[PDB]
Design an enzyme around this catalytic site. Sequence first.
Site, PDB file in Angstrom:
ATOM      1  N   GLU A  35       0.814  -1.219   0.000  1.00 46.31           N
ATOM      2  CA  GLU A  35       0.000   0.000   0.000  1.00 46.31           C
ATOM      3  C   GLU A  35       0.852   1.277   0.000  1.00 46.31           C
ATOM      4  O   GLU A  35       0.564   2.212  -0.751  1.00 46.31           O
ATOM      5  CB  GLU A  35      -0.982   0.019   1.184  1.00 46.31           C
ATOM      6  CG  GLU A  35      -2.146  -0.981   1.091  1.00 46.31           C
ATOM      7  CD  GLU A  35      -3.231  -0.601   0.075  1.00 46.31           C
ATOM      8  OE1 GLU A  35      -3.180   0.506  -0.508  1.00 46.31           O
ATOM      9  OE2 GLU A  35      -4.146  -1.427  -0.135  1.00 46.31           O
ATOM     10  N   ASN A  46      -7.573   9.049  -5.555  1.00 44.20           N
ATOM     11  CA  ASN A  46      -8.467   8.113  -6.249  1.00 44.20           C
ATOM     12  C   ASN A  46      -9.228   8.805  -7.378  1.00 44.20           C
ATOM     13  O   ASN A  46      -9.332  10.033  -7.403  1.00 44.20           O
ATOM     14  CB  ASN A  46      -9.457   7.475  -5.268  1.00 44.20           C
ATOM     15  CG  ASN A  46      -8.771   6.790  -4.099  1.00 44.20           C
ATOM     16  OD1 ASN A  46      -9.075   7.067  -2.937  1.00 44.20           O
ATOM     17  ND2 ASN A  46      -7.840   5.892  -4.399  1.00 44.20           N
ATOM     18  N   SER A  50     -11.505  11.276  -3.945  1.00 44.20           N
ATOM     19  CA  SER A  50     -11.031  10.977  -2.594  1.00 44.20           C
ATOM     20  C   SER A  50      -9.527  10.669  -2.617  1.00 44.20           C
ATOM     21  O   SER A  50      -8.943  10.499  -3.689  1.00 44.20           O
ATOM     22  CB  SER A  50     -11.826   9.821  -1.978  1.00 44.20           C
ATOM     23  OG  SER A  50     -11.514   8.592  -2.604  1.00 44.20           O
ATOM     24  N   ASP A  52      -6.184   8.454  -0.502  1.00 41.71           N
ATOM     25  CA  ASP A  52      -5.699   7.447   0.450  1.00 41.71           C
ATOM     26  C   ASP A  52      -4.484   7.998   1.206  1.00 41.71           C
ATOM     27  O   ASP A  52      -3.591   8.593   0.593  1.00 41.71           O
ATOM     28  CB  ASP A  52      -5.298   6.154  -0.278  1.00 41.71           C
ATOM     29  CG  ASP A  52      -6.474   5.450  -0.971  1.00 41.71           C
ATOM     30  OD1 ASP A  52      -7.650   5.680  -0.612  1.00 41.71           O
ATOM     31  OD2 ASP A  52      -6.210   4.635  -1.886  1.00 41.71           O
ATOM     32  N   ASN A  59      -8.757   5.711   3.270  1.00 44.81           N
ATOM     33  CA  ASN A  59      -9.445   6.527   2.285  1.00 44.81           C
ATOM     34  C   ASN A  59     -10.377   7.589   2.887  1.00 44.81           C
ATOM     35  O   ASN A  59     -11.145   7.306   3.811  1.00 44.81           O
ATOM     36  CB  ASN A  59     -10.176   5.576   1.333  1.00 44.81           C
ATOM     37  CG  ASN A  59     -11.354   6.204   0.663  1.00 44.81           C
ATOM     38  OD1 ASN A  59     -11.213   6.947  -0.305  1.00 44.81           O
ATOM     39  ND2 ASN A  59     -12.541   5.897   1.169  1.00 44.81           N
TER      40      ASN A  59
END
Length: 129
Positions: A35, A46, A50, A52, A59
């Site tokens: 990640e 994203n 949004s 992360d 998120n």
Amino acid sequence: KVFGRCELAAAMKRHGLDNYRGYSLGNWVCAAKFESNFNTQATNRNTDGSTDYGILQINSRWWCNDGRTPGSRNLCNIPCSALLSSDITASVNCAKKIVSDGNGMNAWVAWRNRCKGTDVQAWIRGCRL
Ligand SMILES: O=N[O-]
Ligand SMILES: O=N[O-]
């Protein structure tokens, strides 16, 4: 802060992630690797607008407030910037709520695609845990 592999494993264990909801420590270390590359300052946008945040790429659509995701939720009751701290307490506590949500660790795309069904114990091998 960029964590070492065994350094993060130890912090995650100390914070109570080892076998949380039945997911062994290796699963969390594997997820964090893919990640964020163990980097607490990691951020990724994203497609829906949004973002992360942090070692576990939490998120802003659901979990935190970044002041720029209109109509989203703040289920962990934190600013998203708290997820980027050298101290992983906020990330771990929010991850516990995420993994309890119903989908387990499948909430993390990288885990499902790169960790799930693999020998995750290899991620904690050699560490003094
Ligand atoms: O934290 N050194 O693997
Ligand atoms: O993440 N709320 O802007």
